[PDB]
Amino acid sequence: PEEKFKIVRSVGEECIQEDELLNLLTKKPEPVCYDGFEPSGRMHIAQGVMKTISVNKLTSAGCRVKIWIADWFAKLNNKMGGDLKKIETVGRYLIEIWKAVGMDVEGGKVEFLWSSKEINARADEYWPLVLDIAQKNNLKRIIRCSQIMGRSEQDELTAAQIFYPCMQCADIFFLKADICQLGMDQRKVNVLAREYCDDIKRKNKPIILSHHMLPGLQQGQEKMSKSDPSSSVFMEDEEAEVNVKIKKAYCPPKVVEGNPCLEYIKYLILPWFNEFTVERSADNGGNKTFKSYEELIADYESGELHPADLKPALSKSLNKILEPVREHFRKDSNAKELLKRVKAYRVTK
Template structure:
């Protein structure tokens, strides 16, 4: 029977043919609307090259693809070689994974898939070429979803929650991003992919997108043994594989579970995973979804032609067809379907070579232990990386802590260098500064300018934007992040880094490792809010990366020591005006006879930095004093010899000098522009908090 062309089919016929592909459709009215109104419909499926192809993935998939393309759809296969890498397939070697992918494509060609409107795209190639848009989508999906939501999708890898690595949380994020990256109208995957496809529809709601991908989920073929809800590549006798010999097929079908029961339509559970049932007959399942899934299919048993599956099932249930005859007929039909594949791999030199390579890979064992991943190159000379915090206002305390650590490192390593990394993508992944790129960039750019103008030395410091670091070599960057995820269990990262609010926070933890790997850093300067992430870095590099903790508290909050929360006027910021600084120091807690005195701490720091701190006062109050000894300064302040008002005045003067420098930055055209953006950002955050 000659297949009809799309132009010869009515809308109803096209809809019926496409709909016949799926056991479940979400939503049918959306599918009909697509077929009615959209001229170029794109269907998508992804496959992970993992060594063997069972008959459902081979013949059943070829039939479904042909139905879609006959209806006028384009079918895109996403060859998920990076996903296979995350799942430790083919010893975790990308080149072997690609060869397996090429082999599987050859199988489909031989199985009768019409390639005229079929496109194969390799994820590693496409992602690398379009790294900016692809990974931004992955990060955006991650930051908008909790870890708990993403865990629900992890059944797509057959992983249970307690055994998840951090990399396996990346898998659903990437698969969800694939749908939008490929501009797919229809997700034509198995029912077991239901949760991640639903994640894509939920993401549309989160971003306000009206046109959602239609989910057209095909049936999951059951395993051949009793109680096997689906086939398993780890159990060769649970399924028919595309490379099975005639004898293999006959033996497996002969031993298949085959109860003489009328088959019931199974309810689809929320996760789409098939449910084990003693009533399920895999022999009939194969007939219904492999043999009779083809247009105008029929089978002959003991001289009787059965034109529909329903006729066949009825004849078996009522005893007209014996179990032996049913199985013999199925084996005959399956071998007829597999014969062109066998012939292709026997006669085509390229196909035969691919098959031999794939077979050799199976003997190569498992992926290397997670502890053996690497090694990564490191700089021959000392190189430290420090991450600039993505905050609207950078406190003087953090600015000084970073600057002091940088200074100490460069003084200790005369041939060393410090990279100040602007982590735009990490901030985006964590939803910092509203999560909007414009606002994140404004915060980083303005705080960088203020830091460089005030406390940070310029010699020996190189500024690197994380976006450029990633886009210069996206493949290696994300392979490093994935490898960090492969090595670390999800639960361990949560214990070390603290509870992740979103999946984006988890991805950020892996990005710290990738940053260090790509920069070839030997040291990391570690601020207190990053200590957990940096523990992951140190462990990943097996102690070859040294962490330098920053000394924070030099410029402490200005409130009473026992106060737990700092108010707006309790913290000095780099962008404070003269008025801000005067007001904050005037209100600061500064009791005499107390060691825990924030103004005294600031005074001591200024003395260390400048070598002297001058207190100006009337002669009758003791006259001017130029302190050069921190001990003397502290003694006088705590004894009451130095009045709090005089101490505050002494501290205010040098701080105002810094304000003058900051004002130069803030009053420039660029400074005004960035400041305006951040003022709007603060208003946005204020509205969100209400």
């Protein structure tokens, strides 16, 4: 009752409505979960390692998580020329990555579902939902809810930013999901869904577990990029490529904010191995094993921890995490073909 509650609360960052959370846990121990993402070319580390940690923690807590491959949404967002073959190949490649990274597939906990085959076979349970959603909306209300696709309002506004919010709001009920979690880039759609469900009056609102966006390799981009390699670390680069991509990141000396490495270690390395060993030499003071995150920041902001000892350890940890994925992609032929087919096309941004 309390341990599962704390484990579920540890998944998200800006949690809210704890009473609703405990009520849904007491009335439904095994809920349904999913995630909404936009497949486009390759996957960065935030959509890979952090999502794997999140789904593993939800499985350990007793929550069923489903995979939502968004191909129709990707075609609506105009990516890779709107072709279906390229987008479905990217989706299969992302599924292969999530399967090779370490997913509990044999236990029947994870379920992969494509949007096309799910909406095509259940259009009778999907058209009334989007219809009733579009009925209780307004022009400016939907224009405000156009943050998942990209820019706000003062830009080249297209009609795709009108079809996307209604479908994204209907997906929370079309997939019979009890609770769902994404990030902070969907707050307008969240409040629109809240207003619509209050206007129609149903059961109990799910719990939102928004994840903070990870900044790029330089002081400017606050999100992750799946097109430009000099913005985020992918899930298939070699050791040398990962080292080159990690040694060019913005790392201010002895500064907390503005450095993405702290958030990377907090939401990528710490929940995985449940520890953090700083690989140093015999003259620096030896190896330090950090079990949490407060002591690491306290030692880094005191004058005894330099990036010259944090970047090599982080790169070694990333290489050790990627080694199973590389081995699985090398020992298999279909995974190698998928990798060679996705590492050739263009990725729009």
